């Protein structure tokens with residue numbers, strides 16, 4: 001992993017030592033990027049619902065994992081399931097339970113730094129994972145992108161700035177997540193987000209990671225070419241029913 005500081009460095013160290021899990025997949029691969037394209041083709045707003053109990057820059061949230069996932073199965077294009085333990089209060093067991101309970105795509109959201117975590121995601125029932133440019137060397141990215149693809153999963157490469165984007169396109173990523181929030185400060189920069197979105201080739205499936213909170217903001221990024229959206233952190237955990245308004 002790259003040289004880091006703060007909670008990011010600590011979570012990267014925690015990931016490096018994360019034990020592999022014993023489990024075997026009993027679920028098809030329900031591709032997230034392809035389903036996003038399907039929604040686009042039907043002109044249906046594609047919203048990826050996030051299940052997260054905690055955030056190093058947010059407040060805690062308690063809500064039944066299965067209940068939430070089953071509710072979202074009716075509206076969301078897919079789910080983001082946080083599995084990082086210390087700062088996000090995530091769990092491999094939670095991902096497994098959820099994956100066994102719904103038929104829509106699931107992305108295991110964690111800080112992937114080694115192959116065994118991708119094995120874990122596949123074995124637990126996730127359909128894909130996110131790879132974060134900020135914490136990975138180019139070499140690690142190339143290697144993890146290929147490993148994920150060998151399982152038939154197209155990973156979501158998360159970028160925060162121009163250099164991140166250049167590296168993503170350089171290695172051949174086709175599924176890119178543009179983050180509106182800053183990892184360390186927790187600050188939202190919509191302008192930077194829109195700029196990066198405007199620099200991405202049309203054949204790359206683009207996901208706006210936060211940066212939108214209501215239907216009208218979704219409409220605007222949709223015109224900039226954004227394919228799918230992950231809404232402002234905690235908004236759906238607080239008001240699940242709001243997704244209906246978002247995709248109306």
Ligand SMILES: [Cl-]
Pocket residue numbers: 182
């Ligand atoms: Cl920064």
Ligand SMILES: [Cl-]
Pocket residue numbers: 188189190191
């Ligand atoms: Cl802003």
Ligand SMILES: [Cl-]
Pocket residue numbers: 180188210211212213231232233
């Ligand atoms: Cl936002």
Ligand SMILES: [Cl-]
Pocket residue numbers: 210211212213214217232
């Ligand atoms: Cl917003």
Ligand SMILES: [Cl-]
Pocket residue numbers: 244
């Ligand atoms: Cl209603």
